[PDB]
């Protein structure tokens, strides 16, 4: 019997069309984080951009009602993570994605737990965004309402959109090139 279209495949395909047709990458990030958050039924999806010193800030997001807005006019949410700085991007530098069903089961340090608790994160998936051969930032999906048993299609989907964001950034650089 046939295999009908899958949500993740159709969402990734839609991102590709936007990259082909939309020059405003901010707008691609804003609409795409929204589409991802709807498909994953999670509480926040965010793009985090590294600074040269490996600190960074949230630059785009979609967030459900009842959770704090971390991106917007006259807001700048910075996270200067000393592990990511010391290691120049952690495992993400090696193009690894990471899946955490329960932040209390991951062996995080308490100062890291504190920040996760501040953003009300209970479970997450984090993937790399590479532009050219450099780690440019991270794309993350968060569950704030409770723990979550993420499945393979969900982590693969988020990884694939991270690749597409990377291509979007790279292509914009290429086009300019004036």
Residues at the binding site for (2R,3E)-phycocyanobilin are 79, 91-92, 108-109, 112, 142
Q: Give the binding site for ligand CYC (CB under 6 A).
A: 48, 79, 81-84, 90-91, 98, 108-109, 111-112, 115, 124, 126, 138, 140
Side by side, the strands of the sheet bearing 134-143 are: 78-79, 56-63, 44-50, 134-143, 123-131
Q: Which is nearer to a copy of itself, 96 or 117 (CB)?
A: 96
- Among 16, 4, 7, residue whose Cα is nearest residue 161: 16
Give the rounded distance of the alpha carbon of 26 from its chain centre. 14
Minimum CB separation from a copy of itself for residue 68, in Å?
A: 28
Q: Which two tokens stand for residue 122?
A: 């209970």
Minimum CB separation from ligand CYC for residue 92, in Å?
A: 7
Minimum CB separation from ligand CYC for residue 87, in Å?
A: 9
Question: Residue 112 contacts by C-beta under 8 Å, 6 or more apart in sequence?
Answer: 81, 83
Residue 108 has a CB neighbour count (10 Å cut-off) of 15
Indicate which of ligand CYC, a copy of itself, none lies near residue 138 (CB less than 5 to 8 Å, by partner kind).
ligand CYC
Site residues (CB under 8 A) for a copy of itself? Answer: 2-6, 9-10, 12-13, 16-17, 19-20, 91, 94-99, 155-156, 159-160, 163-164, 167, 171
């Amino acid at each position: 019997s046939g295999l009908v279209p899958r949500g993740s495949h159709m969402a990734v395909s839609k991102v590709m069309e936007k990259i082909l047709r939309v020059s405003n990458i901010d707008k691609i990030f804003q609409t795409t984080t929204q589409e991802i958050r709807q498909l994953l039924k999670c509480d926040r999806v965010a793009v985090y951009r590294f600074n040269p010193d490996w600190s960074g800030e949230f630059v785009a997001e979609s967030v459900g009602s009842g959770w704090v807005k971390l991106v917007g006019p006259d807001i700048k949410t910075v996270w200067e993570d000393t592990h990511l700085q010391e290691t120049q991007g952690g495992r993400y530098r090696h193009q690894e994605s990471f899946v955490v069903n329960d932040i209390y089961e991951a062996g995080h340090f308490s100062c890291h737990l504190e920040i996760l608790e501040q953003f009300e994160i209970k479970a997450y998936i984090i993937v790399p965004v590479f532009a050219a051969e450099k780690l440019w930032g991270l794309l993350a999906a968060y569950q704030n309402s409770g723990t979550r048993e993420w499945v393979e299609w969900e982590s693969s989907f988020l990884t694939q959109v991270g690749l597409q964001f990377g291509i979007a950034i790279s292509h914009a650089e290429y086009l300019e090139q004036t």
